[PDB]
């Protein structure tokens, strides 16, 4: 009930009952943070049609540093507080996040992380996502949600974040383990990076790949701790050592941190800039591909 571990994962059942008990309000806020590649699924319309009762739509496109040239970068403290405060969330709120991904979870772990990096320890992800909420027949609705605004105080927690400069030195110090959550193809350089002009695939030198999807079961639920643990281990990632997670734009890297958290390591840091920023900033000698160089 504190970062002694907070409850990172919440069940559909737990959620439906809080819902039924009138638990949603200032003390319990629900957010849909679905995002899809342009032209595929329509995250916001989907939300307007069907949403867990009382939930608000969390738009990452809005909540980020619009001025950066890179993708999905954290907004500033103020920007964040402002945003969250308007969704009626305060420092005392237990925040539940979910997404509509078919996989069971995609963007939700990113929002979980953002709350943490800004100092809020009381937030969880709906294990199984909307996919399961539906499958189970829990109540869905199209009525609008209009929480009263709250005041939220945000404080950046630097240790859960890594910048371009910090990752570049790590190249020399090797103090932290670097784990890439993208699909192997993109990690290897065999497949291309999507939705980007002149963006090559490949990975930072010394990185280890742990494709995000490997942490979820066929049904879309998080695997269990014992399984998570065995996975990091088969990967040669030691949970007792520092670790930085990176991916394309600092989104699915969040899955490595949730899983490490569930295994008892809450200090996984996220390289927000990620591959997108890296490719455009570092010397080409710092990365590798299974092609063109």
UniProtKB/Swiss-Prot annotation:
List residues, modification N6-succinyllysine.
13, 135, 174, 223, 236
Annotated keywords:
Acetylation, Glycoprotein, Mitochondrion, Phosphoprotein, Repeat, RNA-binding, Transferase
- Effect in UniProt of substituting residue 249 to A: No rhodanese activity
Subcellular localization(s) per the UniProt record: Mitochondrion matrix
Q: Which protein, by its recorded name, is this?
A: Thiosulfate sulfurtransferase
Glycosylated residues (UniProt): 34
Can the keyword DNA-binding be found in this entry's annotation? no
Q: Which GO terms describe its cellular component?
A: mitochondrial matrix; mitochondrion
**Gene symbol?**
TST
Per the UniProt record, the lineage of the source organism begins with: Eukaryota, Metazoa, Chordata, Craniata, Vertebrata
Q: Does the keyword RNA-binding apply?
A: yes
| Protein EC | 2.8.1.1
Residue numbers binding substrate: 186, 249
What CDD domains does the annotation carry? Answer: TST_Repeats (cd01445)
> What Gene Ontology molecular-function terms does this entry list?
3-mercaptopyruvate sulfurtransferase activity; 5S rRNA binding; thiosulfate-cyanide sulfurtransferase activity
Instruction: Map out region (Hinge) in residue numbers.
Output: 143-158
